[PDB]
Amino acid sequence: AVQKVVVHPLVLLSVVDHFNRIGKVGNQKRVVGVLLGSWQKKVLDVSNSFAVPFDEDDKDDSVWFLDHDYLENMYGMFKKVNARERIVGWYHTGPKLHKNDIAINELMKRYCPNSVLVIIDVKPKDLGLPTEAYISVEEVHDDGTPTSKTFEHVTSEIGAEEAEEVGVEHLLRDIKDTTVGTLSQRITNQVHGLKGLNSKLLDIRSYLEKVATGKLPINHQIIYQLQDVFNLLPDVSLQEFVKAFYLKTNDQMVVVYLASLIRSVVALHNLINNKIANRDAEKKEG
Amino acid sequence: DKKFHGILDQGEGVLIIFDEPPVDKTYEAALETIQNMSKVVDSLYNKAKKLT
Amino acid sequence: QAAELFLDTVSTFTSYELMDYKTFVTYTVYVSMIALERPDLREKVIKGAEILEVLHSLPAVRQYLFSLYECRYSVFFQSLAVVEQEMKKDWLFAPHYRYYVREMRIHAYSQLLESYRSLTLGYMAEAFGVGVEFIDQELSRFIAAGRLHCKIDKVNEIVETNRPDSKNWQYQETIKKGDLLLNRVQKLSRVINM
Amino acid sequence: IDAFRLINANMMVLGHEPRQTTSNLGHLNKPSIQALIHGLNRHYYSITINYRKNELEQKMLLNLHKKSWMEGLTLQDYSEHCKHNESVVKEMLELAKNYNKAVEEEDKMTPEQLAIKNVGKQDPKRHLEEHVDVLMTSNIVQCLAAMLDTVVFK
Amino acid sequence: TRPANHRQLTFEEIAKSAKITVNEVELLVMKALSVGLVKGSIDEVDKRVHMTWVQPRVLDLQQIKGMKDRLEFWCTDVKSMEMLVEHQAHDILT
Amino acid sequence: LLKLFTTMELMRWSTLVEDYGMELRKGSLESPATDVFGSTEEGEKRWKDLKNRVVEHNIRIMAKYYTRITMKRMAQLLDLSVDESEAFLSNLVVNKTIFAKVDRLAGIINFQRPKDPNNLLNDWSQKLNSLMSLVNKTTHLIAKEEMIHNLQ
């Protein structure tokens, strides 16, 4: 019953660290570590974490090794330095996940009952794509379909702390993106707010034409999850929109009509005071 | 005497009770801003007349 | 401004500083219906004490206010003519004989055309007064004057009003005060810049 | 945050952090009065701090904190938007009440272009348009945000 | 059958399709609102039923085809309006 | 009891008086049934009040599952005349317990209210926001989740 997780801006920096702590000699091209958290009531929080030596062979894709003794000491070391933080799960990077992630999860559920994984992106960082989290659930599948795992998605957000947010602003120092914007940042928030829109909409038809052909089998779960999108968008016809839209559009044109009136008197007064001061310095210089 | 909201009809003998919109504050406040901008331009006019 | 400072009438002895008190009563009561329509006008001309006694002294003025307040338009028709023949016996009635009538006439029509949007003139033949074609040409002169925002109809006998809903009238008040300021700022803007 | 570093006490007749190689050591640190009273510079000295910023760490730091998807195409929920504009028009109304007398009385009495209306005042032509500036950006965006979804969402 | 174009269906079409009489189409739709297969309302000043369908199901490949064409229309209309915004407000983009 | 819970469960008082009369007449035990109903003027008022409570249940189901209705249909569906139907609704609306408004010129009792243009546009964008952004996010991520189960 996880609503959402809160990833502090510290742990992903430790992943980017440990993505570079192995890349000098390692060709593993995935980083698997241990996620520590603070399960408060219903929302999940992640403050600190660490990593663990893990490898995986591409042949037979079922062989793995976790270091339990390093997990027992270092989590026990963190408990002594901070008896607030505890285990909440694990994490791995790489978009394409290997299939030992059920085998890793079902082992370390002996540590955490509500075990959770967090997928981050180190290289796919160009578009708007945050970190990703799933959940460990065990059902059959749907009704009469064969049994499997089916990691369900839990939505994720990012939240800092008081020093963890003020220390960020001192680091950037390049554009800094001020609060409430002066008509230039706000339009770009609608520009790149829409650049991610059709990128989702191109992605829907790409999976749809993949399954309209029939290569991969269908999932009925996504069908009605897509079907309530199209028969719940509004249709603007008469007396519910076209009356009520002008009632707030002809409302907001009255107050910008003051901006036409007031700002014209502002620059006119600055014109008068300069044309007085110009001709009076001119007539008295000679 | 504003003790009742409605309207009468003589051609049909039909009483019709209706409602009114709110008195909205944001509109006639701007009516009073025009009176100030009318006076400061009047203040700028004889200023520009008295000295060019 | 006249009806505002005539609201306080506490002076009974007449002297070098004061005029006749009886005519001061008639002057403060003829004006107290033009400033305010009914924002509790009944509190200041009826619920008063020192003005209520002296209008209780005079029969015509007490008839004149009750004819306007209780909307006895048949005798308010008569009470306005008795005042106006009396208006000639005055020393300051010059902007009154042609302006106080048509303002009080159009004030009686305006409160009558309230509370009715499908009013007929067949009801006007006995409620307001008498006559048929006189009211038709009377209302036509005031609708064409620009005032009395209502329409008239002949072959259906329905004086259908089209009073605005405190938005379209308020929409006019921005566009009349707006361009009046805009013609002021351009005329300012061209006297300067040589 | 600052970092410090002890100097030996034997070399107190010659330079302490001597040997000027560069000239960038003067504007990276200026010790304040509260710093030079305890140990500076006879006991220890200060050292300069820069930040090792690179890629795939810094860009993704801002690709996750100050980002959005639907924030641009979302209404301001007019229950408090036009309610907010009531209390903005009325306060610039009062500043326009203040503006009428102020300039025209000052110019018509004495043309000094100076005192107490210069030394300790706050009602110029800097204060009356910034309320107009806020009122445009809060509404021109809000007008145009309700224009896209008429086209986009059928 | 109608993809939310004019979802306000009148009594004649239900009485023809469900072969039920006019005196039972009101009892029929209150039973459907009671179960939860739909969350519409019923108007009788025009004898027409407003319908906000909220209970989805499976469909075939034949409805998949027009769904993509509406999605391709959905794709090309949004992308065209982004090109009008990006061209118009490029000088104030920064 | 289970029939008179809610959602009308196909109720009608003329149907109610004709099928459960044997419970109200002599039955097998029927010992508190004569003690409450089927009596002198104490019991006859309880017939009227039971009639009063079912039509009060019948007004509440109409105002929730309808928008407008003709007055001739409401009168015949409550098994009573047009004059009692008006006076019974006039009792409810001055009691501020059923929230509606009638017409005696064309006979359309309506059930909704004139909604406000601030209210209507805010409810437009609210059904625009939570029905085209959250599930729109979900369509993208389930289709990403199906990339793992399908291939390979």
PDB file of C-alpha atoms in Angstrom, chain E residues 23 26-27 30-31 33-34 41-45 74, chain F residues 7-10 65-70 73 108 132:
ATOM      1  CA  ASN E  23     -42.853   2.864 -19.939  1.00  0.00           C
ATOM      2  CA  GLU E  26     -36.764   4.795 -17.164  1.00  0.00           C
ATOM      3  CA  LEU E  27     -36.736   1.763 -14.857  1.00  0.00           C
ATOM      4  CA  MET E  30     -31.989   3.455 -13.053  1.00  0.00           C
ATOM      5  CA  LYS E  31     -31.061  -0.202 -12.637  1.00  0.00           C
ATOM      6  CA  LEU E  33     -27.008   3.483 -12.700  1.00  0.00           C
ATOM      7  CA  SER E  34     -27.580   1.437  -9.542  1.00  0.00           C
ATOM      8  CA  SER E  41     -28.350  11.291 -15.989  1.00  0.00           C
ATOM      9  CA  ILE E  42     -31.887  11.279 -17.388  1.00  0.00           C
ATOM     10  CA  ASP E  43     -33.639  14.296 -18.903  1.00  0.00           C
ATOM     11  CA  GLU E  44     -37.330  14.206 -19.783  1.00  0.00           C
ATOM     12  CA  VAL E  45     -37.917  17.733 -21.110  1.00  0.00           C
ATOM     13  CA  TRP E  74      -4.517  13.478 -32.244  1.00  0.00           C
TER      14      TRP E  74
ATOM     15  CA  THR F   7     -31.211   2.747  -5.419  1.00  0.00           C
ATOM     16  CA  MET F   8     -35.039   2.224  -5.430  1.00  0.00           C
ATOM     17  CA  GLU F   9     -34.646  -1.598  -5.821  1.00  0.00           C
ATOM     18  CA  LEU F  10     -37.818  -1.521  -8.012  1.00  0.00           C
ATOM     19  CA  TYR F  65     -31.167   9.729 -10.851  1.00  0.00           C
ATOM     20  CA  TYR F  66     -32.861  12.418 -12.954  1.00  0.00           C
ATOM     21  CA  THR F  67     -32.443  15.960 -14.194  1.00  0.00           C
ATOM     22  CA  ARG F  68     -35.948  16.948 -15.320  1.00  0.00           C
ATOM     23  CA  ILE F  69     -39.300  15.199 -15.228  1.00  0.00           C
ATOM     24  CA  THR F  70     -42.825  16.133 -16.234  1.00  0.00           C
ATOM     25  CA  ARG F  73     -45.246  11.369 -14.702  1.00  0.00           C
ATOM     26  CA  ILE F 108     -41.202  20.522 -15.482  1.00  0.00           C
ATOM     27  CA  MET F 132      -6.093  13.400 -19.190  1.00  0.00           C
TER      28      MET F 132
END
